[PDB]
Amino acid sequence: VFNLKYTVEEELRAGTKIANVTADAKVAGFAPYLRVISNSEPRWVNLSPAGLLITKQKIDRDAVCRQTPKCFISLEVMSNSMEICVIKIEIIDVNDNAPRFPTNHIDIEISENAAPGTRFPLEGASDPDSGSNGIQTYTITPNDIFGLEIKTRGDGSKIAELVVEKTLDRETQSRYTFELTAEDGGDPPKSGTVQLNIKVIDSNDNNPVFDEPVYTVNVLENSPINTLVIDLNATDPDEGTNGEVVYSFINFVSNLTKQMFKIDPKTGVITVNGVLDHEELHIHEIDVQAKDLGPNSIPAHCKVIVNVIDINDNAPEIKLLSENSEMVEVSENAPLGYVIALVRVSDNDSGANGKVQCRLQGNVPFRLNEFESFSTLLVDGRLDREQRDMYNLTILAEDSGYPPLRSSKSFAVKVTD
Amino acid sequence: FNLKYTVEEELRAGTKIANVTADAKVAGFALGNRQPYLRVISNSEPRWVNLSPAGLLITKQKIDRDAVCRQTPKCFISLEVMSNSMEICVIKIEIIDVNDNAPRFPTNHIDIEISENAAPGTRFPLEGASDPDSGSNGIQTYTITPNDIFGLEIKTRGDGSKIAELVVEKTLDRETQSRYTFELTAEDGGDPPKSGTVQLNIKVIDSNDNNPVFDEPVYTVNVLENSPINTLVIDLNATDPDEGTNGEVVYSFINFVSNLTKQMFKIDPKTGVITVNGVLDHEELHIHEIDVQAKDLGPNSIPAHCKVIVNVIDINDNAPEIKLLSENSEMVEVSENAPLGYVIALVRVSDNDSGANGKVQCRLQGNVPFRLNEFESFSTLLVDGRLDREQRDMYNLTILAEDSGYPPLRSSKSFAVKVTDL
Ligand SMILES: [Ca+2]
Ligand SMILES: [Ca+2]
Ligand SMILES: [Ca+2]
Ligand SMILES: [Ca+2]
Ligand SMILES: [Ca+2]
Ligand SMILES: [Ca+2]
Ligand SMILES: [Ca+2]
Ligand SMILES: [Ca+2]
Ligand SMILES: [Ca+2]
Ligand SMILES: [Ca+2]
Ligand SMILES: [Ca+2]
Ligand SMILES: [Ca+2]
Ligand SMILES: [Ca+2]
Ligand SMILES: [Ca+2]
Ligand SMILES: [Ca+2]
Ligand SMILES: [Ca+2]
Ligand SMILES: [Ca+2]
Ligand SMILES: [Ca+2]
Ligand code: NA
Ligand code: NA
């Protein structure tokens, strides 16, 4: 009641003659000669009454027991009613089934600025063959930014995972592509492969940058509403909303500044939005922020100095300084340059455009004379009042601008003794 | 013709500015017998300064120089007076500033808000104060209560005024410090350098800078086969220091794990509690490899993975099995004339259950006209008493088979056995 043993390969076509067992039954045992009782998987192996042990088909040893060492089948046979024996048939594995990959390729996503060291488990393959003939190494198309760690399992199954070697950046490289191979371990080691698409996702890692921290532009007073002041710009390399800068004024900034100026948020054009006045205020300073729409925003800023320019938008003004500012008087015997009154040569506008000169109408007994702050009305000749009591002067005064402006203070002058 | 004078501001009680009548005489002016020696024609803001019939020049108010002329290096009253008759005379009063206005912030509190992840050299502008004093009596500098992480840069503008600007001197981290409170104060250039102050509230806002750390990389806990639904395999943990949403982790499997894996195992996505969810079986499959990811709900996230190995435990749930190895399933034949060890048939003792739970003993029924003889993998039905066909043509035998497990499982197979002649 003793055993036998026989090796046959797999994937070997039908009827392939494994052993003549009638001759072997002699060589250490007893002597239809044989009757068959029990064989596992008779799909594979039939016997013959001649003692001939033949195969029935191509064996898919990989199918019925993938990735395992020694996979045999056995059977029991009886002599001419005599004692029995066990034949065991191990099915040696061929390197026929090469590495598979389920998908043809796989996409994966990684946030930029993931650390150097980060890992990603990705395992996928199939090499149904067992032992040395199974899977043994995966490997990437070698590069200086992405490496690989095979981690060897307790079974034997070589799993792998994707290490991130060097520091990452989306503004530089926004996607990578690699070829990922998977190898066998047969004398002619076979291998399929797959493409690997990496996609480097946008971290809001830059913040708005201004060209210079201070801008210094000139604009004219009483300007039209919606006239330009400056188109600002803040730069962001980041994707979409993580790079979509938006602009704003920030402080109270003199509540003037709020309603003297408008701002387009999406594009950074500071517009006029009110009656600018030199003679209200001669310079403006506006604090402008600009942040991205992303998360962890760090707004950048600037200051914009608007030097507002004087236009000649105010006439002159002539005030007469006395009791009764519509009329005055002096003597018949009034001497050389009796100062009868002072007057104000007064203008609001800056410098050039508010420098007043003033004559006196026509040929007249009264002259006029200037000093720094005001003007001295001083007589030139004398009235023999004898004939004529009064005569009502007007005083002419034009500023020195363009287009220049005027005004005139008419008043009276009788004479006494 | 010309006279220059000087008063301080905020001087009540009509203080005596000068005696123009004396100073006109010292320079040389009209000796009018007539009484209003000087006649006042013009004066900018008479509200402040009233002259006198007898040539005095007295004041009329606590003058506020900072009101009418804030932040400006000159603020003059000028007034003109004609002689008794003949000549004119311009009088000037330069009002000197004194430090009666200290700096002032608009509130008593400034709440700002920085993000973590803001680099060193990042800046923020900030309003400043209101010192309507003039010259150095105005604001000259600002200061933060000094520290190692924040500082200030004051920039001095063309106007003369000083503008402060909050710079971020060193690398920030919420997880270690989430709030700073500082004192922002603003100084004069006064003889007593007067100085008001205000609170600053930096508030470091959470960036999603951390990604879950798993307690280990490979977890390995064992569960019984046929174990019922919701019997827990392992409670997992991964840790995020970050705030709220950016902190809140969720747990799940990732790959085509094994279509079975998901059929057998749940996982609560909030807690990291992998429960059971199916008829888990040893004789189906003895170990699994569940691949768990945990990522934080929040911006520019990085996930974190681990591998839990669940060893399934063979319990004695599958029976023994007794397969007779003859062509006829239920009966067997043999001659009455047998030689005391005629092997009539074979039988399969067999059990799925691994190791000890499926190693099977097996016996006959009672009294033994025949006998069974266990070998490796199968047994052999030999004979014993070699009996007569004339008395008993047939017997109805039964085999027993009990495994070496607890609770111990047994089954049986009985059959007939007629006898012939040869
Ligand atoms: Ca095959
Ligand atoms: Ca093979
Ligand atoms: Ca292979
Ligand atoms: Ca980047
Ligand atoms: Ca950005
Ligand atoms: Ca980016
Ligand atoms: Ca104007
Ligand atoms: Ca003007
Ligand atoms: Ca003018
Ligand atoms: Ca004052
Ligand atoms: Ca003052
Ligand atoms: Ca002050
Ligand atoms: Ca941190
Ligand atoms: Ca987090
Ligand atoms: Ca954080
Ligand atoms: Ca079972
Ligand atoms: Ca079991
Ligand atoms: Ca059992
Ligand atoms: Na723009
Ligand atoms: Na947990």
Residue numbers in the entry:
A (entry chain A): 1 to 31, 37 to 422
B (entry chain B): 2 to 423
Q: How did the manuscript describe this experimental structure?
A:
Protocadherin-19 (PCDH19) is a member of the non-clustered δ2-protocadherin subfamily that is located on the X-chromosome. Mutations in PCDH19 cause an X-linked, female-limited form of infant-onset epilepsy (PCDH19 female epilepsy, PCDH19-FE; OMIM 300088) that is associated with intellectual disability, as well as compulsive or aggressive behavior and autistic features. However, PCDH19 along with the rest of the non-classical cadherins lack these critical tryptophan residues and must mediate adhesion by an alternative mechanism. Here we present crystals structures of the highly homologous zebrafish Protocadherin-19 (Pcdh19) encompassing repeats EC1-4 and EC3-4.
The EC1 repeat has a disulfide bond at the E-F loop, typical of clustered protocadherins, as well as one of two α-helices (at the B-C loop) also found in structures of clustered protocadherins. The three linker regions of Pcdh19 (EC1-2, EC2-3, EC3-4) have canonical cadherin calcium-binding sites. Analysis of the Pcdh19-I1 antiparallel interface with the Protein Interfaces, Surfaces and Assemblies (PISA) server and with the NOXclass classifier revealed a large interface (~1650 Å2), that is unlikely to be a crystal packing artifact (89.21% biological, 81% obligate). The Pcdh19-I1 interface involves extended and mostly symmetric, in-register contacts between repeats EC2:EC3 that account for ~58% of the interfacial area, as well as smaller, separate EC1:EC4 contacts (~350 Å2 × 2) that are slightly off-register. The antiparallel Pcdh19-I1 dimer interface validated above reveals a homophilic 'forearm handshake' binding mechanism for PCDH19, involving overlap of 4 ECs from each protomer wrapping around each other.
